[PDB]
Design a protein around this motif. Structure first.
Motif, PDB file in Angstrom:
ATOM      1  N   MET A  77       0.819  -1.207   0.000  1.00  0.00           N
ATOM      2  CA  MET A  77       0.000   0.000   0.000  1.00  0.00           C
ATOM      3  C   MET A  77       0.855   1.261   0.000  1.00  0.00           C
ATOM      4  O   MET A  77       0.465   2.271  -0.597  1.00  0.00           O
ATOM      5  N   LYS A 137      -4.339   7.727  -2.585  1.00  0.00           N
ATOM      6  CA  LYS A 137      -5.115   8.678  -1.789  1.00  0.00           C
ATOM      7  C   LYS A 137      -5.103   8.178  -0.345  1.00  0.00           C
ATOM      8  O   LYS A 137      -5.759   7.181  -0.029  1.00  0.00           O
ATOM      9  N   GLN A 194      -3.039  -2.001  -9.489  1.00  0.00           N
ATOM     10  CA  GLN A 194      -4.421  -1.528  -9.409  1.00  0.00           C
ATOM     11  C   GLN A 194      -4.814  -0.753 -10.670  1.00  0.00           C
ATOM     12  O   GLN A 194      -5.102   0.445 -10.634  1.00  0.00           O
ATOM     13  N   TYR A 199      -8.876  -8.525 -13.519  1.00  0.00           N
ATOM     14  CA  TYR A 199      -8.142  -7.574 -14.349  1.00  0.00           C
ATOM     15  C   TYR A 199      -6.839  -8.168 -14.870  1.00  0.00           C
ATOM     16  O   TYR A 199      -6.360  -7.763 -15.935  1.00  0.00           O
ATOM     17  N   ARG A 247     -19.293  -2.935 -12.565  1.00  0.00           N
ATOM     18  CA  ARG A 247     -18.205  -2.164 -13.156  1.00  0.00           C
ATOM     19  C   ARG A 247     -17.006  -3.037 -13.503  1.00  0.00           C
ATOM     20  O   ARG A 247     -16.246  -2.702 -14.418  1.00  0.00           O
ATOM     21  N   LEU A 265      -7.694   2.031   5.722  1.00  0.00           N
ATOM     22  CA  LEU A 265      -8.350   2.680   4.593  1.00  0.00           C
ATOM     23  C   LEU A 265      -7.736   2.255   3.266  1.00  0.00           C
ATOM     24  O   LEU A 265      -8.443   2.172   2.256  1.00  0.00           O
ATOM     25  N   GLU A 266      -6.428   1.985   3.247  1.00  0.00           N
ATOM     26  CA  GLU A 266      -5.784   1.543   2.015  1.00  0.00           C
ATOM     27  C   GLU A 266      -6.265   0.160   1.593  1.00  0.00           C
ATOM     28  O   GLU A 266      -6.359  -0.121   0.393  1.00  0.00           O
ATOM     29  N   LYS A 267      -6.574  -0.711   2.557  1.00  0.00           N
ATOM     30  CA  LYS A 267      -7.102  -2.026   2.217  1.00  0.00           C
ATOM     31  C   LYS A 267      -8.538  -1.940   1.718  1.00  0.00           C
ATOM     32  O   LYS A 267      -8.979  -2.801   0.947  1.00  0.00           O
ATOM     33  N   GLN A 318      -9.743   0.708  -0.092  1.00  0.00           N
ATOM     34  CA  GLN A 318      -9.667   1.246  -1.445  1.00  0.00           C
ATOM     35  C   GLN A 318      -9.147   0.224  -2.446  1.00  0.00           C
ATOM     36  O   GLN A 318      -9.480   0.314  -3.633  1.00  0.00           O
ATOM     37  N   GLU A 319      -8.346  -0.743  -1.998  1.00  0.00           N
ATOM     38  CA  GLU A 319      -7.819  -1.758  -2.903  1.00  0.00           C
ATOM     39  C   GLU A 319      -8.849  -2.836  -3.214  1.00  0.00           C
ATOM     40  O   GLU A 319      -8.889  -3.340  -4.342  1.00  0.00           O
ATOM     41  N   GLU A 368     -11.806  -1.460  -5.641  1.00  0.00           N
ATOM     42  CA  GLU A 368     -11.428  -1.189  -7.022  1.00  0.00           C
ATOM     43  C   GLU A 368     -11.040  -2.456  -7.775  1.00  0.00           C
ATOM     44  O   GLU A 368     -11.375  -2.600  -8.957  1.00  0.00           O
ATOM     45  N   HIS A 426     -16.350   4.168  -7.152  1.00  0.00           N
ATOM     46  CA  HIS A 426     -15.515   2.975  -7.086  1.00  0.00           C
ATOM     47  C   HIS A 426     -14.958   2.711  -5.692  1.00  0.00           C
ATOM     48  O   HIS A 426     -14.207   1.746  -5.517  1.00  0.00           O
ATOM     49  N   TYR A 427     -15.305   3.535  -4.705  1.00  0.00           N
ATOM     50  CA  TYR A 427     -14.907   3.319  -3.319  1.00  0.00           C
ATOM     51  C   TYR A 427     -16.099   3.101  -2.403  1.00  0.00           C
ATOM     52  O   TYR A 427     -16.103   2.150  -1.613  1.00  0.00           O
TER      53      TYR A 427
END
Ligand code: SF4
Ligand SMILES: [Zn+2]
Ligand SMILES: [Zn+2]
Ligand SMILES: [Zn+2]
Lengths: 97, 299, 385, 49, 732
Positions: free
Chosen positions: B207, B213, B278, C174, C197, E571-573, E575-576, E579, E603-604
């Motif tokens: 990460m 972000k 990603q 992906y 999506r 939070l990073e886990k 968002q991954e 997506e 997408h989040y």
């Protein structure tokens, strides 16, 4: 003719299984029985465990009911003795092991 | 787990089935036909008859000959054309047998399910309940899911079995509290805690290497700038320190959070090794309410 | 305190006859009907051969109460119309049925062009139990291995239809997109409710479209668009040789029972035995079997004839309707070129080649079956003859 | 991270199977079989039509 | 004209609001919800002004609240610079300064990767203007801070840098030719057409420098996300002290005694030589950069802090005067923490009776403590940071204890136990941190979308003649879908404002509705609870009945933790997974850490769930004092202030899943308290366009059927919908 050679699969291989058990026979006669009366001389609820039916001299009886009596162990047919050892894979597998 | 009945002194007859998560459901009998003779039959037939299962122990192969051995009907055709020296072995594996060997090649290395985020996450809940009571394994490889979630078990099973100990005394050590998943083990909690710390350290470096972000990075510098911590100190004001409640209900949730969140990330790093980055498409920053669908192919 | 508000509420609901005087429910109906969108997309391809692998979902989500209380009988029943319509306009092409259940991808039917085999196979899935946990990577990786054997000259698109589950991604699809592009295959995704999506980008990178079904009438219209080949143009898929041109025979002279009929026991056509009346035969091998446009088992190529085989693909090629022109003088022959009579209710459609006036019953038949204009025979071959 | 125990083991075996569906017919007979009444009009029978 | 987004219309309404501000010359309030382009339309009108040749003096300082949003403002301001830079042809220069201090500082590898900001910047400044100002040149001590000396060179010179830069633009320029964020920041403040930073620097009467000239009726200030201003104006000037920080302050003070003790007579004479210069002088050269680090201007609503260093006549004499401020404070603080006590005159008058000094040396002791080490300067900020917390507390007493209060909560009252006592000293009237801001500049315009109840706005006691809402004319209302579920005449159990684990009817309803929504939302779900106490009791109750276990089958669980180190990695886990694979779910608090500014989109997380009204714990005495003082100004508004703070945090958790128009977010208010209050202090564009239809008295069964309309109709907008304007404002 075409440099592709992508084939299929990404992370599905390993060696399937064939390594879950296969242990030499070690146990024989059970010794567990828990309790059957009424807990600490109470009421309402009672403890009930498990105990399969073993064939002893052609008469159906419980598995642990015969093991506690030495006079009913050596008095049985040899054909039913092979099933007496195979039935040991229940309480020795649920407990301890 | 265990069942309970009623004695001869009690006028009521209720059946209690204790599960594993602490859910006890009572069953008051009301069979007007025969109840005295059946209240014990339900107790007896549930303890004198227990189901079992089979574990296959046979050497497997990887060559194309496995497809013919598993099907005795299809194997008869191989003995009438190749063994009967009427044709050649290459002609049989060209057009006669091509539509069957293609679909059968995918189920030779299929380990239950390939996914872990959706196709398998909906079925991993009843499989991660490694308790006792009366539960037993199935015919398929049910312990393979632990290898995908606990990498330390794979090394401890091959370096100590049947080396130091055997299968008779090894699995019950790690499964001392699989439903709890963070119990203390004298077999090696040292190796289990070090393996979980390596996964959390490896997943954290992925990460940081990305970083698209991270608003939480500035929240620390925003509060430390005015030299005031009047809001960060009072994090969890449960008002129960000596009662062992603030560090009990909160610890039982955060610890389970690191086990479920890192389970999906650990299974994803063993497939593509964080090489996808990603997607990384410039269309993520663009948030306009328009489109660019003007090029019509083959028009 | 319930009667204090329930008594006054009934006083307003009882006087519901006053709302019928206003033209609210009437003015909207006439304005919502005139909303005729026009987004003509050139969906056409010169490639005549098509290979498709329809993916049918068999999870526990196929029983929700949406369009009907039994969703399992909504996809299987409407899929039979897509198979029958596929062989009607493209008989030389074939499709496939691949189901997904118990976290596995079991291929039901093979790659054959038998319309009866694909229709009768869908009725067996009614008794099939719906466990759950669908897998998309399993039903997509197997379809690519079988499709790889086909020579590079077709669109080789893949159709995937599921119950619009919340992101049906097993474990990072992906990474597979970079692999599916090397095989020059295409993926088509159809939604039923929630948006997906993770499959929208897959339908764009490989080459296709993404649509979500909104009503029972919308599912039939979307299947009609998939009858035509996907609009594309490549350079590495334009090589093919040896096309099978069979001929129709009757295997008799005067009576069918006096002759040994067709598709019997000793006949070489042992693929589909029974008791028929005629079939096709390869001109280079003289192998008589079923007359269905399927791949033979002595050459290695499908049958593409001309009368009622290759013409069905060209019959759908001229996909065009007619235009309109308003006027405030009431003039324009008012004599139909096909059925003489008109309608005389503000309906004037002219042609862009011969300029002919049609009615409401002729314009629908053009865009549905006629596919051209009757005036193009009495005007275009006129100067050339 | 606390600790837990008491009755936490694993069961392994290799048997069972072979003829198990034949016992479902005897246990189902204890309930009630779906059947109508003995229809008898002692006059004129039906004609489907 | 700025061709980019489709015309609603919207820039026609924002153009008229920017004209009355210059004429009226006062503070203005503009409602800008997240559903309307408050960045593309705003930056399109702002540069038309930057070119105001007529308007003699024209500025903009624009703020925001998070370090990512700074960058967001930057990039968006980039492109609108791009297009009518192209359109108007010949380009006139520009500057927008993202002025990020601490966390975006140093290019030296020895300094950079230590995690915190303040301490490491102390190592930086101790190296630059404490060791290399004292040891003014050497070879090892005076460290290679070489591009500060490059700043010396080009601060003698005149470059002209190009345009508005990112945060990382200035680090990449650090490598190439851009110099230090601080010092280039200084040279670029010398002339900057637009500086973007956080409003916490201006709304803090401590180290605030106002970064402006001597003009008091000029410049233009534009705030962003200034809806939560009632607490920032109080928590900024708030000071506290714990026993752990007091123990370190006494330990490091003994080290300073050994420094002066080992000084003979030759070096001691040099210390007294600078004491005479500081008295006769007033424009010391050390007031250019060291003032921003230490307590600059604590008396912001008054004047500057510059005296003739009172309370000191000798070097060793000042140590005994400061030692009495520590030995007596520990005796007065420990004696009042035995029982509860709340009295402002108890600490002000009690300290003057014990320490028999004046209010002049105690007021300037914070500035003299920093100048004491400037003469020896062989020290560093690591040993001076514990001494700053004590000097900052004494400053807020000699000139601020006449209007504040002291809250003492020692024995189990939202504070740590006896192992770490703590006292409270905050403000009540949130206007002391904003009055100098309105007086130093001309007009200040705040931009907040969640700030819709304007009846409670005069809490700040400031005029606001420019008042206007925002409706945003949109054809298809498939953008948002507010829903309110409150059971009704079926169970009526959905609210829990003063209940813990006494019942299981409300907890079961929260798990049944959340389990159904986890299978119909196409992406992620961002839920929020009330506080940390009710959140832990709800999750723990799902483990017995078997509710949270079924949620783990579909989406992945993400619950906010307590420590800040494990929150950034959590939070990073999220968002991954949202997506790459299936969108997970967030189970956090409305006032936690993922509610300040995450800007999560489709997408989040495109689903918002609100479990009850996010109220506050008014029983605590740290907040009751802030409300008791309101009764002196507003008597009838003793209850409306709690409704504003409850609906502001509720709309803040909602106004984040959507940013443009095609995001299509969903919000749910699963509570029965949203009955009549939805037509007063709520969004004006939600009542006429959403709350008009009957959808407030819904239940768990009815809330799912209504939610299906937003999840099914959203599939229609795909090719084209509301496309008006044709890149020319429809000739308007
Ligand atoms: S001045 Fe610029 S370089 Fe020198 S320390 Fe501060 S950042 Fe690091
Ligand atoms: Zn042939
Ligand atoms: Zn006509
Ligand atoms: Zn024509």
């Amino acid at each position: 003719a075409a440099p592709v050679t992508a084939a299929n699969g990404s992370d599905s291989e390993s060696e399937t299984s064939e390594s879950d058990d296969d242990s030499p026979p070690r146990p024989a006669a059970v010794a567990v029985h828990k309790r059957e009366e009424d807990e600490e001389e109470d009421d309402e609820f009672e403890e009930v465990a498990d105990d399969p039916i073993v064939m002893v001299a052609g008469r159906p009886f419980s598995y642990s009911e015969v093991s506690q009596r030495p006079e009913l162990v050596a008095q049985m047919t040899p054909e039913e003795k092979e099933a007496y050892i195979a039935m040991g894979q229940r309480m020795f597998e649920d407990l301890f092991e | 787990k265990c069942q309970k009945i009623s004695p001869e002194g009690k006028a009521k007859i209720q059946l209690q089935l204790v599960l594993h998560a602490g859910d006890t459901t009572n069953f008051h009998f009301s069979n007007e036909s025969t109840a005295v003779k059946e209240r014990d039959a339900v107790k007896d037939l549930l303890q004198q008859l227990l189901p079992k299962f089979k574990r296959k122990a046979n050497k497997e192969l990887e060559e194309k000959n496995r497809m013919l051995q598993e099907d005795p009907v299809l194997f008869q055709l191989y003995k009438d054309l190749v063994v009967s020296q009427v044709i050649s072995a290459e002609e049989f594996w060209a057009n006669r047998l091509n539509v069957n060997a293609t679909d059968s090649s995918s189920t030779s290395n299929h380990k239950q399910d390939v996914g872990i985020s959706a196709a398998f996450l909906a079925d991993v809940r009843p499989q991660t309940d490694g308790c006792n009571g009366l539960r037993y394994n199935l015919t398929s490889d049910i312990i393979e899911s632990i290898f995908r979630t606990y990498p330390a078990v794979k090394m401890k099973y091959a370096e100590n079995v049947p080396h130091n100990m055997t299968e008779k005394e090894f699995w019950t050590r790690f499964f001392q509290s699989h439903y709890f998943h963070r119990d203390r083990l004298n077999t090696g909690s040292k190796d289990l805690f070090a393996e979980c710390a390596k996964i959390d350290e490896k997943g954290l470096k992925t990460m940081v290497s990305l970083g698209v972000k991270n608003p939480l990075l500035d929240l620390t510098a925003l509060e430390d700038k005015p030299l005031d911590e009047g809001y960060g100190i009072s994090s969890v004001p449960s008002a129960s320190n000596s009662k062992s409640i603030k560090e009990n209900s909160n610890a039982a949730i955060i610890k389970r959070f690191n086990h479920h969140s890192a389970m999906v990330l650990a299974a994803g790093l063993r497939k593509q090794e964080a090489q996808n980055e990603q997607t990384s498409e410039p269309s993520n920053m663009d948030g306009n309410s328009g489109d660019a669908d003007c090029f019509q192919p083959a028009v | 305190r319930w009667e204090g508000g329930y008594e006054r509420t009934w006083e307003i609901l009882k006087e519901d006859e006053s709302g019928s005087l206003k033209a609210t429910i009437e003015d909207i109906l006439f304005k919502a009907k005139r909303k005729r969108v026009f987004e003509h997309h050139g969906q056409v391809r010169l490639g005549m051969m098509r290979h498709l692998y329809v993916v049918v979902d068999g999870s526990r989500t196929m029983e929700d109460q949406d369009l009907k209380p039994n969703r399992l009988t909504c996809t299987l029943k409407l899929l039979e119309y897509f198979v029958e319509e596929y062989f009607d306009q493209n008989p030389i092409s074939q499709i496939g049925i691949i189901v997904t259940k118990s976290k596995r991808a079991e291929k039901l039917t093979e790659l054959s062009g038998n319309p009866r085999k694909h229709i009768t196979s869908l009725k067996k899935a009614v008794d099939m139990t719906c466990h759950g946990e669908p897998s998309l990577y399993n039903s997509l990786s197997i379809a690519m291995q079988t499709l790889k054997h086909m020579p590079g000259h077709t669109s080789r698109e893949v159709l995937i239809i599921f119950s619009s589950l919340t992101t049906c991604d097993p474990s990072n699809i992906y990474d597979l997109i970079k692999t599916l592009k090397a095989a020059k295959i295409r993926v088509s995704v159809i939604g039923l409710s929630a948006e997906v999506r993770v499959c929208t980008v897959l339908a764009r990178e490989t080459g296709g479209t993404y649509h979500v079904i909104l009503d029972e009438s919308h599912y039939k219209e979307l299947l009609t668009h998939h009858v035509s080949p996907p609009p594309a143009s490549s350079s590495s898929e334009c090589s093919l040789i040896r096309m099978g041109f069979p001929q129709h025979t009757i295997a008799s002279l005067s009576d069918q029972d006096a002759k040994p009929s067709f598709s019997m026991a000793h006949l070489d056509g042992n693929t589909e035995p029974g008791l028929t009346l005629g079939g096709y035969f390869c001109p280079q091998c003289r192998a008589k079997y079923c007359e269905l446009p399927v791949e033979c088992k002595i050459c290695g190529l499908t049958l593409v004839s001309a009368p009622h085989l290759a013409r069905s693909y060209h019959h759908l090629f001229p996909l065009d309707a007619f235009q309109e022109i308003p006027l405030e003088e009431y003039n324009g022959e008012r004599f139909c070129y096909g059925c003489q009579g008109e309608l005389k209710d503000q309906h004037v459609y002219v042609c862009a080649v011969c300029q002919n006036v049609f009615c409401v019953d002729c314009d629908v038949f053009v865009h549905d079956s006629l596919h051209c204009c009757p005036g193009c025979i009495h005007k275009i071959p006129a100067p050339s003859g | 991270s606390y600790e837990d125990l008491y009755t936490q083991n694993v069961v392994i075996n290799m048997d069972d199977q072979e003829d198990l569906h034949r016992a479902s017919l005897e246990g189902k007979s204890a309930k009630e079989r779906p059947i109508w009444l003995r229809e008898s009009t002692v006059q004129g029978a039906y004609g489907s039509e | 004209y700025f061709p980019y987004d489709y015309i609603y219309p919207e820039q026609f309404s924002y153009m008229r609001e920017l004209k009355r501000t210059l004429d009226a010359k006062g503070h203005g309030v503009l409602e800008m919800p997240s559903g309307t382009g408050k960045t593309v339309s705003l930056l399109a009108l702002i540069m038309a002004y930057q070119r105001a040749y007529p308007l003699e003096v024209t500025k903009l300082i624009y703020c925001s609240r998070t370090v990512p949003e700074i960058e967001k403002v930057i990039e968006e301001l980039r492109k609108l610079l791009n297009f009518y830079e192209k359109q108007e042809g010949e380009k006139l220069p520009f500057l927008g300064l993202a002025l990020s201090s601490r966390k975006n500082l140093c290019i030296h590898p020895e300094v950079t990767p230590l995690r915190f900001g303040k301490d490491v910047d102390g190592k930086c400044h101790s190296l630059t203007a404490s060791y290399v100002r004292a040891q003014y040149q050497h070879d090892t001590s005076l460290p290679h801070c070489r591009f500060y000396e490059e700043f010396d060179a080009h601060g003698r010179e005149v470059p002209l840098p190009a345009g508005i830069y990112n945060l990382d633009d200035l680090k990449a320029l650090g490598r190439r030719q851009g110099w230090c964020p601080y010092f280039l920041a200084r040279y670029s403040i010398l002339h900057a057409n637009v500086v973007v930073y956080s409003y916490h620097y201006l709304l803090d009467p401590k180290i605030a420098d106002l970064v402006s000239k001597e003009l008091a009726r000029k410049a233009v200030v534009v705030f962003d996300e200034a809806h939560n201003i009632d607490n920032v104006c109080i928590d900024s000037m708030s000071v506290n002290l714990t026993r752990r920080t007091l123990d370190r302050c006494q330990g490091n003070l003994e080290t300073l005694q050994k420094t002066v003790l080992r000084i003979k007579e030759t070096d001691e004479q040099r210390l007294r030589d600078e004491y005479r210069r500081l008295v006769e002088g007033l424009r010391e050269a050390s007031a250019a950069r060291e003032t921003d680090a230490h307590l600059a201007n604590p008396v912001l609503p008054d004047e500057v802090l510059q005296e003739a260093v009172p309370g000191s006549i000798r070097t060793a004499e000042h140590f005994l005067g400061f030692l009495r401020r520590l030995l007596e404070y520990v005796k007065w603080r420990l004696r009042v923490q035995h029982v509860v006590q709340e009295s402002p005159p108890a600490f002000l008058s009690g300290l003057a009776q014990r320490v028999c000094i004046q209010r002049k040396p105690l007021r300037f002791c914070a500035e003299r403590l920093r100048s004491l080490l400037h003469t020896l300067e062989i020290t560093d900020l690591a040993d001076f940071s514990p001494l700053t917390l004590l000097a900052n507390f004494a400053t807020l007493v000699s000139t601020y204890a006449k209007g504040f209060t002291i809250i003492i909560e020692p024995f189990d009252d939202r504070t740590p136990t006896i192992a770490n006592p703590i006292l409270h000293f905050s403000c009540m009237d949130a206007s002391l941190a904003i009055k100098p801001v309105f007086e130093r500049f001309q007009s200040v315009i705040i931009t907040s979308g969640t700030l819709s109840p304007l009846d409670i706005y005069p809490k700040i006691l400031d005029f606001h003649p420019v008042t206007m809402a925002t409706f945003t004319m949109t054809l298809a209302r498939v953008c948002l879908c507010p829903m309110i579920i409150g059971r009704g005449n079926d169970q009526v159990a959905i609210s829990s404002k003063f209940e813990t684990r006494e019942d299981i009817a409300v907890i079961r309803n929260y798990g049944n509705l959340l389990l159904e929504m986890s299978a119909v939302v196409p992406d992620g779900i961002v839920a929020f609870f009330t506080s940390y106490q009710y959140m832990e009791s709800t999750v723990a109750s799902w483990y017995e009945q078997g509710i949270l276990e079924n949620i783990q089958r579909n989406k992945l669980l993400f619950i906010e933790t307590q420590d800040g180190a494990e929150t950034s990695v959590a939070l990073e886990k999220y968002q991954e997974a949202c997506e790459n694979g299936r969108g997970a779910i967030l189970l956090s608090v409305a006032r936690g850490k993922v509610s300040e500014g995450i800007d999560f989109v489709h997408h989040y997380g495109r689903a918002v769930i609100m479990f009850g009204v996010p109220y506050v714990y008014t029983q605590s005495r740290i907040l009751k004092a802030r409300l008791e003082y309101l009764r002196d100004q507003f008597q009838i508004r003793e209850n409306d202030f709690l409704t504003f703070d409850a609906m502001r945090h509720a709309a803040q958790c909602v106004g984040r899943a959507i940013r443009g128009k095609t995001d299509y977010g969903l919000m749910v208010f699963a509570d029965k308290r949203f009955a009549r209050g939805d037509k007063r202090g709520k969004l004006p564009r939600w009542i006429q366009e959403h709350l008009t239809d009957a959808n407030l008295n819904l239940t768990v069964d009815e809330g799912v059927q209504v939610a299906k309309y937003f999840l099914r109709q959203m599939a229609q907008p795909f090719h084209r919908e509301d496309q008006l304007g044709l890149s020319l404002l429809s000739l308007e």
